[PDB]
Each structure stands twice: as C-alpha cells, then as structure tokens.
Amino acid sequence: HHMELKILVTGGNVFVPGRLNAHFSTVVYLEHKDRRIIIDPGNLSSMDELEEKFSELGISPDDITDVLFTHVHLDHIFNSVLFENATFYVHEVYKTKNYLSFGTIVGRIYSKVISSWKNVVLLKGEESLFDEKVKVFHTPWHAREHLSFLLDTENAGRVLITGDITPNRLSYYDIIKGYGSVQVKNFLDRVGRIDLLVFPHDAPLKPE
Amino acid sequence: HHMELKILVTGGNVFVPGRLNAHFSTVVYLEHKDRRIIIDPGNLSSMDELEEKFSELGISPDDITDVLFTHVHLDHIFNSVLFENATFYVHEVYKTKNYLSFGTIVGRIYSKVISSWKNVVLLKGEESLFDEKVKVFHTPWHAREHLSFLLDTENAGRVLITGDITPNRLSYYDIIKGYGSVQVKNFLDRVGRIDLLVFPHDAPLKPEV
Amino acid sequence: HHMELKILVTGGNVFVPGRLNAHFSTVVYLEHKDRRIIIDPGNLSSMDELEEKFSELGISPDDITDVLFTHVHLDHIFNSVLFENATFYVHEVYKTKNYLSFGTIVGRIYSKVISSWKNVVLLKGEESLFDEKVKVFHTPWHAREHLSFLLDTENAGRVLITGDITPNRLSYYDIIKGYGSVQVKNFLDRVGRIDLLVFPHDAPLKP
Amino acid sequence: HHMELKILVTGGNVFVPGRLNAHFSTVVYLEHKDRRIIIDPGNLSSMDELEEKFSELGISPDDITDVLFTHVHLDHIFNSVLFENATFYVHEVYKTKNYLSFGTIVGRIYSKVISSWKNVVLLKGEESLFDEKVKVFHTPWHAREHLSFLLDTENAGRVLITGDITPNRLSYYDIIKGYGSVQVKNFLDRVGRIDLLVFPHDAPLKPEV
Ligand code: NI
Ligand code: NI
Ligand code: NI
Ligand code: NI
Ligand code: NI
Ligand code: NI
Ligand code: NI
Ligand code: NI
C-alpha cells in the first residue's frame, strides 16, 4: 500500500507591517489506503487554488480524514475549519499557550479555529503514523509545539515537510553555508538523505 | 448628538489568479450616542491593523453594537465573525443567493460567516438609520444586494461609503470622464454635494467641485 | 504562416494604499514568421515567472523584435527596459502627456522607462499589423492612448487583448449585466465573436 | 552637529513562488550637516510611500548625497536608480559576484541597477563614517557583501540597521530564544546596548533589556 503525495499549494508571504498579513503555507495532500491526509491546510488566501486542486482530485473537504499541523500559526491552520470529518494532529504543548493573549482580535480568531477541531490527537514527537509512512519529529526551533514530518512516498521518495524551522530555500541555504541554526542543522543531519525538502513558504527543493 | 467617523483600514487588493486572494475592504467605524458601528468589517488580512486601531480606541470587538454591509463578499464581511454582540444590517435580497454554489470550499466559508450573524436587520434601500445620520441606498451595480451609505458626520462632513460600485479612485475618475457606469454616475448626481468619497479598495477622496 | 500565442503571465493586483504598489499586467507572447512579439511586457514583480517562461521557450529578451503597449502605465510597460532590440508600438497621443508631472519619484521612473524606447512606431488605431494578424483598436476608456488588440491565432483562435478597459472578469461581467461602460459594451459588440478574452489583471475567459 | 533619523518605509514581503516577487526593504533616511543619506533605498513597489515622504520632507531625489547598501539584493537597491547625485557605499566583495549568472532576466536587471552607480565607495567593514556617527560592520551571514550599520542619532538614540541577517522580529526572537545563528547572536552581543533595532522587512523594535 503506497502513499502518494501532491503539493496542492506552494506557500509564500504577503506582509506589510501594520496593514496586511496574508502569509500562506504550503499545503500537502497524501493518499494512503482509505486515508486522505492534509499537512498544513493553509490560509484563507489560498481558497481559489484549493478549490481548483480539490476539483482536479474529485474530492470535497468532507472526504479529508486526517489533518496534521507543523504548528499552530494561522497561516498554516486556518483552513482546518473546512474539514469537519477529520482527525487533527498537533503537538501536545500547544495546549500550554494562551491564544487569547495573542491580541483581542487575533486571539479570537485562533480561538475560533482551534475550537472547531472536534477530534484531536496530541503528539509528543517520534511517533511513526499511517503504517510507518509518516515519521513525526519534534522540532521546537520556531514555536514550542513545532513538528516536522518525514514521509515515505511512492511518487516523490523520501520527503521532509520542514515547517517553519526553514521557511524557504534561503533559510536552508544559510544552514548549508554554516551560519544558520545549529539545532536545525543537526536535525537535518539526523534525518539524512532525502529526495525532497518541502518548505512552508517556498517551492520545494531536491537537496544537493 | 454628533456622529464621529474613523477610517480604521483603507482597503486594497491582493490578487494573483489561481494562487492568492487577499482582497481587503476599507473598514469604517462610527460612534453615535451609545452605538459603536462598523461598516464593512473587512478581511482577515487586516487583523494587525484592526488590532492597533481597536487598541487606540480603547474598545474590544464585544463593544461593537451594529455592523452594516455594502454587500456579501468575503473581503468585506469576513471579520463579522468577531462581533458577537452586534446587530447586522444587509439588503434582503442576499437571502436569494445560494452561497454554497460559490464552490465547495469558498461556499463553505461564506456559509460559516453568514451563519454567525444571530441578529439581522434586512434592508430594502432608502432607510434612514441612527437618528437620520445614515442614509441607505440600494445600488445593485456590482451585486444584487449591494448598498451604499451616506453619513452625516461631525468631523468629516457628508461622507459617501460607495462600496464596490466604485472600488477605487480610478473607477470614480472613469465616471467623471464620461465612460463609466451610467447608473453609478446617475447615483452620484442624485447624492449631490458631499465632502468625502470612501472607496472600499483605495484611500478616500474629496470630490471635484 | 501561422501566429502562435502563449500567455507568459496572467496579471493581477497588489495594492495597499500608501504602502505597496505591485500591480502587474498579463504578458502575451506571439510568434509569427521571424517575429517574436510581446504585448504588455509587464512589471518588475513578474521577473521570476518571465525568467521561467523565457527559459522554457529557449529565448532571450534580446530575441524580442516587437513590443506593443495597450497603454503607458508602469505595471504594463516597466519590463520594456529588457528588450533593447525591439521596435515599440504605442498610440501617438502618449506624447501629449507630461509623465514628469506624475510625481517627482514616479514621474522619474516613467521617464526613464519611456526614454529607453529607441525605435518607436506611433499608432492611431485601426491599423492591421503583422500580415493582418493583429488588428489595433483605439479604446480610450481608461487612458487617452489606450489600445486593444485583436489577434488571429492558430492555437487559440480569435483573441482579444482588452487592456484596462476591462481589467478582470468581474468588469466584463458588469458589462454583460448591463451596468458597465456603454462605450466598452459597444466596442465588444463591434468586435463580435471571439474565442478568448485576455484581461490584463485576471486569467482569460472564453466569452 | 546632530544626526536625525527618519524611517521612510518599514519593509515587508510579497512573494508567491513562480508568480510574484515584490519584496521591499525598509528605507532609512538620515540628515547630518549638509548630507542627506539613504540606507537601503528599497524597491519599486514602495514608490507611492517614498513619493509621500519626500514630499513631506520637502526634498527631491536630486538632493540625496549618499546611499549605503546593507547588501546587493534587488529589494534593497532598486530605487538607487533615482539618486543621480549620490555617492554609493557597498562592501568591496560585491565585485566578486557574477550578477549575470542570476538568470537572463534577473541578471539583466541587477546589471542595469549596478551600472547606474557612477560614484562608489568600497567598504571593508569597521569604517566609521559621517564624523563617526555611522559605524560599519561586515556581517556576512546572508550574503558575502552584507553590512550592518550602527547609528548614533539625536532623535532615536543608538540604532542598529541589521539588514537581512535578521529580516524581521521573529528572526530576532529566534536568536534571543537560543536557536538562531550563533554568528548573529555574537554580533548583537558585540554591539551591546542599543535603543532600536531596524529590520529590513518588519517594523523596528526596542530590544529586550
Ligand atoms: Ni510559523
Ligand atoms: Ni509559516
Ligand atoms: Ni464586491
Ligand atoms: Ni470589494
Ligand atoms: Ni492602466
Ligand atoms: Ni493595468
Ligand atoms: Ni537579502
Ligand atoms: Ni531583504
């Protein structure tokens, strides 16, 4: 039973201080057996791209069975409100944050999104999920609850969903050049040879 | 009892076909007597600006008493989900649209936003609200439920919230130059002399003499 | 001799009053005989998409022979600076505008772009260009120099490059619904049956 | 003779892979004696904001005497084409990069911008400029030519223009939390107590005690 990967959205940034916040994460779709899995469902601003991709795939949001989060930042999780039948997976320490302290307005939005998750599995890191096709790593070098996911796929080989420990190619290159996070560098060394790096705010890359 | 206007957000556009939709409306705040009124609460992408402005004003979303919509487009209405204590005002023909036919995904979002409105006043056009400080016009030259609002303010004089019949200054200039919508031009002629045009996707403008 | 169309970039809008102006036009590429033609070269913010498309096509900006402008707005014309070997086509009345009056900063950028056009063909409207494959219409319902182009293509049929008289699909729908520009509506009636509408700030549409 | 700081633009990001690149840096303006100084003139997309700030200041691009670059990335340097009378300052090792190899189109744009700089001062790091009001640091943890600038200002105290070694507040917080660049962290330790951090793609921040 093979796991197939599709990148529904490659993420990016839209940010003007005090005026515009439309960051949007990469959205990863996986099919394995009877599971239809999303990692980082993304932000509202990706709605038209997702509409198009769901239509190509012949599926509805109602068919998504499992949704995993690298972390609890709105630009990665907002679209979670679409998936009423999914089980949601997230690192347990997210429960130690007071999201209502994020600002009157912003906190209310986090709270409404988070409250919509009716079935939640809390992770610790090191789990291997979906018949060992998905390995979970606790990678708290961005947010305390941050996770990265290593995927054993048929069509794309061994794929690392980095999350925001490496938001884009430049951040990855900074690690290679030796002046980035020592923790992230050590983590990448631990993971070892992979076929594809899937960043949250850039197009993916085959490591050199 | 004077009505005071503050423009919390001047709107704009962020659109890349097939990739990015982050249009965001102008957000207008009005204080009159014990009412705290918003016209077009805007889009999620304005959340940091709104945070700042609410903080300057010393208010919370819970203090908003009334929210009016030019029309039912997400970039104007999304933030309506923040105002749990407000009465919502919208043109009655919005009920004749099937929002779930807007796309599986996009329809679901519209439906969830619209369902959050627990107290709704249905407008027809021509209403004079808030002790005659707000005049409602049915201006369906964009969407069937579209409304424009004329405000009698103390601090900004006579202010027309156009909505999307004139999204920005260039669209207004096209009317003035004679090659824009005949219906919108007629409407502006009807309204007559005003002090300020507040567009949904641009900075406001003092009109030509 | 057939004319082939490729849409290199579908345009859009990025605009925050007082803070951000990154509007970018649709960029149309046409090959006909030995001509490599661009209509509305676009804005700086399309640079990565253009790099990718030029690389797919196996061409350089040096190989572009002809560049036509719907009108002289920066989000349509900026990338003209890349095409040093091209002949530029533009409506003659652009010369009657004082671009340095656009603002000290913005005027300077217009002036620098416009000064880079070394070979210019001035159009009036109604011209048929490239062995009658491109018909030029003067459509001054946005800017006095504004042009629209009707293209007789092999791969996409009859294609109207609207320019900013209809920036996107919504503006076209407003005309269909009867409350948009009467002049644009009459223009579209005059053009008649076409296979594709190519807007400057949206994906194209089969009418 | 005091040096006055004005932040003309706070920078940001606009990036959609394969479709849109409109990153734009913070733009810093300094007045000292007869000098009108820009650090990182920014990107084309800031043109309306710059227009408005230049108008407020009562100056033209022709009045800018000095322009310094944190580094040679288009979103920081593009607007350099506006300043015909300026001396440009940049780390010498930029000359070792082949900008034509950045891609046919992108390389062309870099080359045209860089060619417009008629008077250039090549920096090495550790220079003290403008009567010692500006200290230059070689901070190559982003690009080989990358510089940061420490400013002694009258109106904002001691200000660090970080450049892209810390693009925004989150990158700075990562350093404070202990999992960011060791080199950047050691650099901030070396700089010591300052009043303001000016990031290239975010609003500035008063540092942590
Ligand atoms: Ni994050
Ligand atoms: Ni992120
Ligand atoms: Ni609308
Ligand atoms: Ni709108
Ligand atoms: Ni235009
Ligand atoms: Ni345009
Ligand atoms: Ni950089
Ligand atoms: Ni930068």
Give the whole-angstrom CA distance, residue B101 versus residue B107: 6
At residue B146, what is the residue type?
H
* Reported CATH class of domain D1-209: alpha beta
Residue with tokens 């970018």: C24
Show the tokens assigned to D30: 């300094």
Among D10, D15, D16, D51, the strongest candidate for a mutation testing the B interface, having the largest count of B CBs within 10 A, is: D16
Report yes or no: A159 and A135 within 8 Å, Cβ to Cβ: no
Report yes or no: C105 and D82 within 8 Å, Cβ to Cβ: yes
Q: Could you tell me which chains touch chain C, where touching means 3 or more CB pairs under 8 A?
A: A, B, D
Cβ-Cβ pairs closer than 8 A, B with C, add up to 54
CB atoms C179 and B141 under 8 Å: yes
Q: How far is the CA of C41 from the centre of ligand 5 (A)?
A: 13
Beta bridge partners of D137: D148
**Spacing of C-alpha B45 from chain mean position:** 16
Question: What element of type H or E holds B107?
Answer: helix B104-115
* Helix (H/G/I), strand (E/B), else coil: A27: strand
Give the whole-angstrom CA distance, residue A94 versus residue A122: 9
Return the exposure string of D5-30: e unless at least 16 CB atoms fall within 10 Å of the residue's CB, then b: bebbbbbbbbbbbebbbbbbbbbbbb
Please report residues of B whose CB lies closer than 8 A to that of C202.
15, 17
Report yes or no: A138 and A91 within 8 Å, Cβ to Cβ: yes
Please report residues of D whose CB lies closer than 8 A to that of B14.
14
At residue C126, what is the residue type?
E
Report yes or no: C61 and C54 within 8 Å, Cβ to Cβ: yes
* Helix (H/G/I), strand (E/B), else coil: D175: helix
Region of B65 on the Ramachandran plot (φ > 0 left; ψ -120 to 50 alpha; else beta): alpha
Q: How far is the CA of D80 from the centre of ligand 7 (A)?
A: 16
Show the tokens assigned to B166: 């004139």
At residue A159, what is the residue type?
V
**CA of B17 to nearest chain D CA: how many angstroms apart?**
9
Residue of A nearest to C19 (CA): A16
- The runs of H, that is alpha helices, within chain A are 47-57, 74-77, 104-115, 169-176, 182-191
Give the whole-angstrom CA distance, residue C90 versus residue C95: 10
Report yes or no: A78 and A44 within 8 Å, Cβ to Cβ: yes
**Which B-chain residues 98-137 have CB contacts (< 8 A) with chain A?**
103-106, 108-109, 112
Q: Could you tell me which chains touch chain A, where touching means 3 or more CB pairs under 8 A?
A: B, C, D
Give the whole-angstrom CA distance, residue B85 versus residue C85: 64
CATH homologous superfamily for the domain C1-207: Ribonuclease Z/Hydroxyacylglutathione hydrolase-like (3.60.15.10)
Q: How far is the CA of D167 from the centre of ligand 7 (A)?
A: 8
CB atoms B184 and C181 under 8 Å: no
Please report residues of C whose CB lies closer than 8 A to that of D109.
44, 47, 82
CB atoms D14 and A17 under 8 Å: no
Decide if C182 touches B, using CB distance below 8 A.
yes
Residue with tokens 């202990």: D178
Question: What element of type H or E holds B7?
Answer: strand B3-9
Please report residues of C whose CB lies closer than 8 A to that of A13.
none
Give the whole-angstrom CA distance, residue A83 versus residue D178: 36
Decide if B171 touches C, using CB distance below 8 A.
no
* Nearest partner of D182 among A170, D190, D136, D124, judged by Cα: D190
Report yes or no: A36 and A54 within 8 Å, Cβ to Cβ: no
Report yes or no: B36 and B57 within 8 Å, Cβ to Cβ: no
CB atoms C51 and D82 under 8 Å: no
* Helix (H/G/I), strand (E/B), else coil: D168: coil
Beta bridge partners of B87: B66
* Reported CATH class of domain A1-208: alpha beta
Return the exposure string of A78-98: e unless at least 16 CB atoms fall within 10 Å of the residue's CB, then b: bbbbbbeebbbbbbebbeeee
Domain ranges in chain A are 1-208
Question: Among positive and negative, which fits the CA dihedral C129, C194, C74, A49?
Answer: negative
Please report residues of B whose CB lies closer than 8 A to that of D14.
14
Give the whole-angstrom CA distance, residue D180 versus residue D198: 18
Give the whole-angstrom CA distance, residue B144 versus residue B40: 17
Give the whole-angstrom CA distance, residue D157 versus residue D151: 8
Among D16, D74, D170, the strongest candidate for a mutation testing the A interface, having the largest count of A CBs within 10 A, is: D16
**CA of A203 to nearest chain D CA: how many angstroms apart?**
6
* Nearest partner of A84 among A109, A65, A107, A110, judged by Cα: A65
Chain breaks in chain B (C to N over 2.5 A) after: none
Q: Could you tell me which chains touch chain D, where touching means 3 or more CB pairs under 8 A?
A: A, B, C
* Helix (H/G/I), strand (E/B), else coil: C160: strand
DSSP sequence for C49-107 = HHHHHHHHHT--GGG--EEE-S---HHHHGGGGG-TTPEEEEEGGGGGS-GGGG-HHHH
From the number of C-beta atoms within 10 Å of its C-beta (0-12, 13-18, 19+), residue C124 rates as exposed
DSSP sequence for C113-152 = HHHT--SEEEE-S--EETTTTEEEEE--SSSTT-EEEEEE
* Nearest partner of B201 among B161, B159, B150, judged by Cα: B161
